[PDB]
Write a protein that binds this ligand. Structure first.
Ligand SMILES: CCCCCCCCCCCCCCCCCC(=O)OC[C@H](COP(=O)([O-])OCC(O)COP(=O)([O-])OC[C@@H](COC(=O)CCCCCCCCCCCCCCCCC)OC(=O)CCCCCCCCCCCCCCCCC)OC(=O)CCCCCCCCCCCCCCCCC
Ligand SMILES: CCCCCCCCCCCCCCCCCC(=O)OC[C@H](COP(=O)([O-])OCC(O)COP(=O)([O-])OC[C@@H](COC(=O)CCCCCCCCCCCCCCCCC)OC(=O)CCCCCCCCCCCCCCCCC)OC(=O)CCCCCCCCCCCCCCCCC
Ligand SMILES: CCCCCCCCCCCCCCCCC[C@@H](O)O[C@H](CO[C@H](O)CCCCCCCCCCCCCCC)COP(=O)(O)OCC[N+](C)(C)C
Ligand SMILES: CCCCCCCC/C=C\CCCCCCCC(=O)OC[C@H](COP(=O)(O)OCCN)OC(=O)CCCCCCC/C=C\CCCCCCCC
Ligand SMILES: CCCCCCCC/C=C\CCCCCCCC(=O)OC[C@H](COP(=O)(O)OCCN)OC(=O)CCCCCCC/C=C\CCCCCCCC
Ligand SMILES: CCCCCCCC/C=C\CCCCCCCC(=O)OC[C@H](COP(=O)(O)OCCN)OC(=O)CCCCCCC/C=C\CCCCCCCC
Ligand SMILES: CCCCCCCC/C=C\CCCCCCCC(=O)O[C@H](COC(=O)CCCCCCC/C=C/CCCCCCCC)COP(=O)(O)OCCN
Lengths: 603, 128, 459, 156, 178
């Protein structure tokens, strides 16, 4: 009966079998990564069926299968939600993950613990699938924490490196800062709505107050790395390139945005929180693009581009278009994952070299990576009828054609221009000039794994936008009528950014050298935010933790008050009482005084 | 001329920008020679203890024991009641408690008053 | 209830009559069998309680604590069997006798239908712990620690006894059932205020409260591995059990009198979590983590709501298991290193991978990662506190952040990085240590499947 | 193997005990400087420079290359605060004050101009969206037994 | 790295270090090869204007304003080699570096595999053992009275002798053990 439930639970169930077999013999052989990749591909082709059923009928479900503890009138159960969002996001995530493991087959070929790496990737995928399909807040929290712990483990993959451990702890710190708001939202929802289920929460909140939505916004800012809590996402590039391509670019980092998508019925009934979301998204995308346009590490540039796209997603949520933000998530996963895969291929070909100053002529030296990166950059900047167009163009039109703040719209436009700027910066500095790598050329691409993994996401980044846009039902009123100039605002802004950044980059060939300005230093040092905020608070905390908390109070004053004072007083009284020289004259005089006092006082 | 770099607590002075380094003198040279002699003696002792094949244990580090002992067990016997210490202890051990007490007391009196007047709208508030 | 007490008493004759090289095997086997027997007490009712007789009764608050107490003894024996290798048979039998006596006293304490009997056993548990700390301890400060661990306790417990007998002169019965059924409100008077203080501070000193937590780092550091296990896992929960049992008669005076202790706990959790960040000792860091968790439990008990009590019970069970595991891992490091300093031995994941996995799991379960019962208790207490007042969430979130910070700091400092070069006596981990870690960790991940078993009588 | 005399003591007041303490901690008498004699129990422990371990020389052959420490040399009182995984004092290309001012100015300008944009929003030359059935009264909240005021929309 | 440090840095060492840092940061500024070559030759010409200078006070005044100018234009994000102390792969393979003494704790079933390796290891241990007593004596007889002045170790002077304190330098794990 109704195969939708059976299929949509079977995908997630069969995603867990290699974890069970990790204790078997196959885990000790070299066929384990192939086992995991085959399992993921089968899961994707099996999850393609519920998507087809939804596109045919629009069928949605809630599967509350197992009953957990019941606490008075509150019931907790293992409940999975299979709405449009889950049944659409699962296939895309599975496709991207399949491509990522196929790429990691070649990229991690020399890593001794490759089976453990694939197990970690599969565990992260399982936790993310738990997060996406969750119907209640406790299961969503379970996924929220699973993805964070897996990110911590994968960032510090090389545990002999100090910086990897530092970045992992940084990510954990920022995600716990978001966890504060997540827990606040959970507590408020249970206290007032008497349930953590999505249905009851939506029903009992006709006009949602500020506090739960502010908690959700804080959690989303923490997980999606908004401006206040951004640096952990740039710092997460310490992990292996497959980790940066899968977790911190396309799947995990959108999770916070997804959270705000899940609570959109409560989002639309509040205006202040929507304004806060829009402002945060605008400032985040602007700041991240401005930091990106002047970096030398390619992975850092891609991470900053991802953060700018997340800020754009948050702006879209703030302007009351959750479905459009979900579509942007779907397209961004495709093209950003393929872009990171191209970056990793180039990185491996140049003997683990990441700075763009040592990368020269690769347009002819490596052609497939060249064409894949060109297509990805065109999709990211937005080329009509590509996968990035069907999302970003509508984002820009919705921002322009709705009652927003002028400053947020201006920063969105400037962020689009800066996105074009850093895309052309990457292409120019990595593919056009004369070669600058060491003389021993080790450039090679003849490997079916890398080529197939890149080309699958290439076909995706070319066709998926059109297919998905023309397949899903309409979920919003279109902007059918538009000013002619305002119809082309995004295109002219992108072209202007392309041309201006190309002209600026072409002046590096000139035989003239000048010292940098203050704006360049501000943008290159990430607005100086990583310096101050990672040196001023932490020290001022840690010092206190040893000066006031540990030594002043715990070791000195709390010791002085109760135990030491008692010891001193008892010692003094014992010395005074016991210090009698043994002369019976004094004792007899004291006895006489006591007898007189007793006779004159107790009668 | 160029703008001058200003040192701070969390951004110390660069090694190549210290005025003391360029003021070379025989006394400074002798001090550096003695410092390197001390470091060399300690390194020689450590290597002599380290490369010994008979040793099958950790090499005790008196610096580490001194650090741990001074951090943990040497605090109170050297403590003296001082206006600085008395004031700082009173502040950091009493002020936060009374501050949080005032905050929570004000919040709870506000909530209790709102409940007594009945204007709180506690519908669906069942679990507590 | 005697079906559990009598085998525990027979554990003594068996140990003494046991062959000179078969004490550990017999003790472990029969302790595990007694734990299996005590497992039957989990079958509770939604009605009053399991009243076995006039002297002993069971409850769904007492049942998980009794199960944990019975389960701890085999783990304590397995941990202690290592460092007592060069020790004479008579003194090893004396050590096992002290452990058995402590378990018997705890088992009788957790049933305790009458409050004076509860006090007698609750203070009788002191002597074996003091003997264990002051006899089988390594450092010279152990004696001092023992003194502290003694007098603090008595400084809180002697007034309680007076209050207790005073109540029997007024109420006429100290039986828990009659006390619950015949409870009457406390008038807001100075005499009632002092009776409240006498009834409360005895249990607040053993949790311990933030102001009165000085004895705990000393006692935990200088005690042997079994002493640290029993102190962190079970002995800290006596105060919480006593508070939950005795707060019935303290109403409605609890509302006014809870404020100083609530403020002290809510700020001392932050203070101890921050103290954990700057610590050069593993055992001290674990002790301060225990202080933070028990401060949260104190907040839960003082809030006095059903969710508060459920979260408190779950948190006590989870914290006991987690702290015992952490102390065991630290002792396994110390037995190889003999320094007990975090920064001395580093990069142990390279040399001992399975022990690194055990360390990771222990740190994760101390970090309150869902759906572990640690997270269940923490979340229930947080929600109850938010219902109590919406401003507590700031302090709770700060505590969670610092807790995660210091947990991962402990993990990274000892497991990650580069190994110490001059240390060469790091032998592969034995089967005993790995089995100890597994037997510590598996019950947690099995209990998260059936949370209602540890949620207490208000479930 | 550690003796009683090789443990920290009280504050040194005369040059003889200062030299003895300097010898104890394996450093020159000139380089030795105890913490100021106040209530906090520093005793006689060297007040080494507050420089972090990140900016120690990364090419020297340290006995602990990760911590960048030598075997017998004295340990800074706040070593655990400076472990290359925590606060570092490495000099920056731009001065601390300049970075502070630039970051604060950027944040303040962003907040002020966001408030300004909130004061002056952007919209299209259109009227409010019209909804057919009493502004969707029945499908938004319900309450069919109240008969809301009939709203009629404009044809133009 | 391998060479022992000196008590101080001479003026020529300081100027060479400044030249190295300035050229590296100029290469970081000048991405393209021809531009870097032109500006590096210009910088070399600017440096060799004062090569023949003799006044030590004026020489110290030099290189100091040069260091200040370098600090002002030090390219706040310079190029770093991947394995350098600031590179992206500085300590990537330190987690795979296992000590040699760990092999002494292997199970006999594990030592059943690779028998030739453990035979050679036994010869190495004997050679270290016989050699060590002699090395200590050489160090004791060669070290100047009052303790060493520079952490430089002497070589072996006899026929059958070996360099003092050689075991942990010869037995480094690898640069890429796995
Ligand atoms: C996910 C689905 C799972 C389904 C399959 C069932 C698996 C059962 C496993 C139960 C737990 C394992 C026992 C703990 C001790 C570890 C044993 C060991 O030493 O390993 C040796 C063995 C051999 O390794 P080796 O090569 O010889 O040694 C190399 C070194 O050891 C080097 O070691 P390493 O580098 O390989 O690391 C070992 C590995 C594994 O070791 C561990 O760390 C295990 C820790 C797991 C949880 C950590 C505590 C947090 C609290 C969670 C409590 C939930 C429990 C649920 C009930 C459990 C029932 C017992 O560590 C990790 O990978 C990190 C895991 C962190 C994941 C965070 C996400 C947590 C929440 C996930 C959702 C759970 C509920 C889902 C609800 C909604 C969906 C229905 O390795 C393994 O067997 C790996 C185990 C498989 C991974 C398990 C991680 C997820 C499982 C979560 C709990 C069970 C969920 C039940 C259904 C979920 C759907
Ligand atoms: C209504 C009609 C609509 C049409 C309007 C008109 C259409 C466009 C008109 C054009 C307008 C300007 C376009 C040129 C942009 C400048 C590019 C340039 O020349 O850079 C070189 C030059 C310095 O180069 P350098 O230091 O020698 O670097 C050495 C090598 O080049 C090192 O080279 P490298 O290899 O390392 O990397 C090269 C990289 C590195 O270059 C950089 O260093 C980048 C830094 C400057 C470029 C960033 C411009 C983005 C502006 C967003 C700012 C938002 C507000 C921020 C508030 C800050 C508050 C302090 O450069 C690039 O790759 C491209 C940079 C970005 C240019 C392309 C996109 C920008 C055009 C879009 C702007 C507006 C059109 C939006 C369209 C939508 C329609 C409304 O940059 C400048 O001189 C700055 C010019 C503008 C900066 C304004 C911010 C100044 C803030 C000071 C205080 C202000 C008052 C605040 C008071 C607060 C008190 C509370
Ligand atoms: C050190 C580490 C922690 C250890 C434990 C510390 C916690 C114990 C603190 C006990 C709580 C406070 C004790 C009494 C609280 C009663 C409420 C009082 O504070 O409020 C006012 C009370 O007024 C004044 O407080 C009068 C008392 C003043 C004398 C107390 C000394 C104040 C500071 C001393 C602190 C030292 C405590 C520890 C001693 C060892 C209200 O005025 P009033 O309505 O009229 O009285 C109501 C009570 N009636 C109805 C019974 C009459
Ligand atoms: C597997 C091998 C056997 C294969 C053949 C059997 C195929 C299925 C037939 C089994 C019979 C059905 C069954 O299992 O019984 C249901 C039984 C419980 O019985 P109920 O009465 O419905 O609820 C408990 C209250 N009385 O359900 C089960 O236990 C099995 C399936 C439950 C879900 C699987 C567990 C996965 C999640 C683990 C826990 C995760 C943490 C907690 C979740 C938090 C959610 C907020
Ligand atoms: C009315 C009277 C009330 C009496 C209260 C008695 C409190 C119980 C502790 C009594 C200890 C008094 C003895 C004492 O301190 O001597 C100083 C002694 C010196 O060491 P010695 O071994 O004796 O000799 C060393 C030189 N060869 O100092 C110590 O070592 C003390 C170390 C342990 C202290 C014990 C902890 C006591 C404080 C805990 C709380 C109890 C406070 C009292 C009640 C509080 C009020 C409710
Ligand atoms: C509130 C939180 C208060 C801050 C907590 C301080 C905790 C101190 C102890 C942490 C341990 C020390 C530590 O982690 O090391 C510092 C470590 C290393 O720095 P790196 O840049 O990685 O250097 C590597 C290159 N060599 O940096 C860190 O991770 C520390 C991070 C501290 C961040 C504190 C500032 C956060 C403030 C956020 C406010 C904005 C919120 C956004 C609002 C959103 C609302 C919708
Ligand atoms: C770790 C150290 C903690 C120490 C705990 C100490 C706190 C407990 C309070 C002090 C002891 C009081 C014991 C009283 C036992 C309860 C009996 C009772 O309350 O009955 C009252 C008796 O109340 C009293 O007499 C109490 C007087 C207190 C005398 C001893 C003072 C001890 C120190 C007091 C200052 C400290 C206060 C806070 C201490 C907190 C601990 C830090 C009624 O008396 P009746 O005459 O029968 O009434 C007839 C008319 N209606």
């Amino acid at each position: 009966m109704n195969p939708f439930a059976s299929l949509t639970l079977t995908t997630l169930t069969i995603l867990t079998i290699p974890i069970m077999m990790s204790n078997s013999n196959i885990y000790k052989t070299n066929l384990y990564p192939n086992y995991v990749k085959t399992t993921v591909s089968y899961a994707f082709t099996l999850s393609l069926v519920p998507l087809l059923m939804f596109m045919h009928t629009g069928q949605e479900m809630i599967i509350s299968n197992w009953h957990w503890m019941t606490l008075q009138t509150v019931e907790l159960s293992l409940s999975f939600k299979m709405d449009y969002f889950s049944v659409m996001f699962i296939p895309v995530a599975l496709f991207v993950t399949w491509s990522i493991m196929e790429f990691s087959m070649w990229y991690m070929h020399s890593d001794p613990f490759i089976n453990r790496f694939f197990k970690y990737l599969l565990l992260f995928l399982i936790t993310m699938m738990i997060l996406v399909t969750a119907n209640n807040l406790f299961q969503l929290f379970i996924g929220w924490e699973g993805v964070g712990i897996m990110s911590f483990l994968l960032i510090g993959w090389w545990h002999g490196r100090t910086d990897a451990n530092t970045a992992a702890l940084q990510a954990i710190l920022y995600n716990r800062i978001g966890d504060i708001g997540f827990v606040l939202s959970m507590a408020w929802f249970l206290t007032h709505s008497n349930a953590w289920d999505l249905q009851q929460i939506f029903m009992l909140n006709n006009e949602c107050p500020n506090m739960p939505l502010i908690g959700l916004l804080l959690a989303a800012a923490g997980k999606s790395a908004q401006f206040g809590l951004h640096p952990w996402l740039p710092s997460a590039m310490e992990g292996p390139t497959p980790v940066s391509a899968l977790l911190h670019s396309s799947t995990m980092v959108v999770a916070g945005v997804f959270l705000l998508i899940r609570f959109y019925p409560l989002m639309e009934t509040n205006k202040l929180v929507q304004t806060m979301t829009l402002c945060l998204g605008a400032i985040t995308t602007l700041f991240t693009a401005l930091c990106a346009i002047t970096q030398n590490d390619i992975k850092k540039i891609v991470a900053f581009s991802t953060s700018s796209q997340l800020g754009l997603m948050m702006v879209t949520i703030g302007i009351n278009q959750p479905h459009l933000a979900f579509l942007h998530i779907c397209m961004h996963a495709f093209f950003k994952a393929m872009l990171f895969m191209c970056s990793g291929s180039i990185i491996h070909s140049l003997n683990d070299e990441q700075d763009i100053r040592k990368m020269g002529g690769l347009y002819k030296a490596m052609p497939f990576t060249t064409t894949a990166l060109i297509i990805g950059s065109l999709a990211l900047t937005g080329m009509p009828y590509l996968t990035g167009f069907y999302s970003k163009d509508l984002i820009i039109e919705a921002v322009n054609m709705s009652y927003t703040n002028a400053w947020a719209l201006l920063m969105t436009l400037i962020a689009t221009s800066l996105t074009a700027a850093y895309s052309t910066r990457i292409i120019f500095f990595a593919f056009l000039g004369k070669p600058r790598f060491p003389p021993l050329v080790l450039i090679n691409e003849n490997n079916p794994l890398l080529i197939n993994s890149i080309k699958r996401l290439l076909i995706g980044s070319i066709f998926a936008g059109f297919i998905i846009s023309n397949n899903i039902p309409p979920m919003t009123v279109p902007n059918t009528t538009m000013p002619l100039y305002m119809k082309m605002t995004a295109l002219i802004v992108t072209i202007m950014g392309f041309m201006l950044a190309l002209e600026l980059n072409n002046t590096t060939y000139y035989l003239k050298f000048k010292y940098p300005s203050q704006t360049y230093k501000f943008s290159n040092m990430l607005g100086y935010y990583p310096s101050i905020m990672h040196r001023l608070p932490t020290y001022h905390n840690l010092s206190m933790s040893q000066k006031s908390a540990s030594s002043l109070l715990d070791l000195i004053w709390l010791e002085t008050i109760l135990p030491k004072t008692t010891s001193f007083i008892q010692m003094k009284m014992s010395i005074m009482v016991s210090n009698q020289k043994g002369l019976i004259k004094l004792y007899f005089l004291s006895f006489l005084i006591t007898i007189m006092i007793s006779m004159t006082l107790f009668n | 001329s160029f703008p001058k770099y200003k040192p701070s607590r969390l951004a110390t002075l660069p090694a190549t920008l210290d005025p003391a380094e360029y003021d070379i003198s025989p006394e400074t040279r002798k001090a550096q020679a003695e410092r390197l002699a001390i470091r060399s003696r300690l390194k020689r002792e450590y290597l002599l203890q380290y490369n010994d094949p008979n040793r099958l244990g950790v090499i005790e580090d008196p610096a580490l024991i001194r650090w741990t002992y001074a951090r943990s067990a040497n605090i109170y016997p050297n403590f003296r009641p001082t206006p600085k210490t008395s004031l700082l202890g009173a502040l950091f051990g009493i002020g936060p408690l009374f501050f949080w007490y005032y905050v929570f007391k004000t919040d709870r009196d506000k909530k209790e008053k709102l409940i007594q007047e009945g204007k709180l709208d506690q519908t669906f508030n069942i679990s507590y | 209830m005697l079906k559990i007490i009598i085998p525990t008493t027979m554990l003594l004759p068996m140990t003494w009559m046991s062959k000179h090289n078969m004490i550990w095997i017999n003790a472990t086997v029969h302790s595990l069998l007694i734990s299996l027997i005590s497992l039957s007490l989990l079958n509770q009712l939604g009605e009053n309680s399991l009243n076995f007789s006039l002297t002993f009764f069971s409850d769904s608050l007492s049942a998980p604590l009794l199960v944990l107490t019975t389960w701890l003894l085999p783990l304590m024996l397995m941990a202690s069997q290592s460092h007592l290798s060069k020790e004479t048979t008579t003194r090893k039998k004396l050590y096992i006798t002290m452990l058995i006596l402590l378990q018997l006293f705890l088992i009788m304490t957790f049933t305790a239908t009458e409050l004076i009997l509860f006090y007698i056993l609750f203070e009788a548990t002191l002597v074996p712990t003091l003997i264990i700390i002051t006899r089988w301890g390594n450092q010279t400060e152990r004696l001092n620690a023992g003194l502290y661990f003694l007098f603090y306790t008595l400084a809180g417990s002697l007034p309680l006894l007076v209050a207790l007998v005073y109540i029997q002169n007024t109420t006429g019965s100290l039986n828990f059932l009659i006390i619950h059924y015949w409870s009457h409100p406390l008038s807001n008077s100075w005499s009632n205020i002092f009776m409240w203080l006498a009834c409360i501070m005895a249990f607040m000193v053993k949790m311990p409260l933030y102001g009165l937590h000085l004895w705990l780092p000393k006692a935990h550091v200088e005690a042997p591995i079994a002493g640290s296990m029993v102190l962190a896992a079970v002995l800290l929960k006596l105060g919480g059990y006593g508070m939950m049992r005795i707060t019935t008669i303290l109403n409605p005076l609890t509302n006014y009198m809870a404020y100083p202790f609530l403020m002290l706990s809510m700020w001392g959790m932050i203070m101890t979590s921050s103290i954990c960040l700057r610590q050069t000792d593993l055992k001290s860091l674990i002790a301060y983590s225990s202080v933070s968790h028990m401060a949260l439990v104190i907040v839960a008990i003082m809030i006095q709501t059903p969710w508060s009590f459920m979260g408190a019970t779950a948190l006590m069970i989870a914290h006991g298991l987690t702290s015992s595991m952490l102390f065991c891992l630290a002792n396994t490091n110390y037995e190889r290193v003999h320094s007990r300093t975090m920064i001395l031995a580093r990069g142990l994941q390279t040399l001992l991978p399975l022990m690194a996995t055990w360390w990771l799991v222990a740190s994760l379960t101390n970090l309150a990662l869902p759906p572990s019962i640690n997270l269940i208790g923490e979340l229930f207490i947080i929600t109850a506190s938010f219902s109590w007042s919406n401003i507590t969430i700031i302090l709770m979130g700060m505590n969670m952040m610092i807790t995660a910070l210091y947990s991962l700091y402990m993990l990274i400092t000892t497991q990650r990085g580069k190994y110490t070069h001059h240390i060469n006596n790091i032998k592969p981990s034995f089967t005993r240590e790995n089995a100890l870690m597994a037997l510590h960790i598996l019950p947690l991940l099995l209990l998260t499947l059936n949370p209602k078993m540890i949620l207490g009588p208000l479930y | 193997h550690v003796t009683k005399d090789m443990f920290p003591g009280p504050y040194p007041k005369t040059p003889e005990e200062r030299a003895a303490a300097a010898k104890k901690y394996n450093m020159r008498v000139e380089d030795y400087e105890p913490y100021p004699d106040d209530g906090m129990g520093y005793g006689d422990y060297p007040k080494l420079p507050d420089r972090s371990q990140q900016e120690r020389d990364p090419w020297y052959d340290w006995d602990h290359p990760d911590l960048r420490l030598n075997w017998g040399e004295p340990i800074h009182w706040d070593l655990d605060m400076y472990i290359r995984n925590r606060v570092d004092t490495s000099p920056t290309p731009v001065s601390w004050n300049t970075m502070c001012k630039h970051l604060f100015g950027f944040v303040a300008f962003m907040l002020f101009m966001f408030w300004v944009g909130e004061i002056y929003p952007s919209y299209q030359p259109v009227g409010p969206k019209q909804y057919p059935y009493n502004d969707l009264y029945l499908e938004r909240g319900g309450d069919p037994t109240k008969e809301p005021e009939p709203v009629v929309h404009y044809e133009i | 790295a391998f060479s022992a440090p000196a008590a101080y840095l001479t003026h020529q060492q300081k100027v060479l270090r400044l030249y190295k840092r300035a050229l590296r940061h100029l290469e970081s500024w000048c991405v393209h090869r021809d531009k870097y070559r032109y500006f590096a030759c210009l910088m070399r010409a600017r440096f060799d204007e004062h090569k023949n200078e003799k006044d030590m006070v004026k020489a110290t005044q030099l290189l100091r304003q040069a260091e200040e100018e370098f600090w002002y234009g030090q390219h706040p994000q310079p190029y770093i080699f991947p394995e350098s102390p600031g590179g992206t792969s500085y300590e990537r393979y330190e987690c795979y570096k296992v000590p040699e003494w760990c092999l002494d704790d292997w199970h006999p079933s594990e030592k059943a595999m690779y028998p030739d390796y453990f035979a050679k290891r036994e010869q190495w241990k004997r050679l270290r053992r016989e050699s060590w007593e002699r090395e200590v004596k050489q160090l004791q007889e060669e070290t100047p009275p009052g303790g060493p002045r520079t952490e430089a170790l002497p070589p072996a002077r006899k026929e059958g002798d070996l360099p003092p304190l050689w075991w942990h330098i010869v037995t480094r794990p690898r640069e890429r053990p796995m």
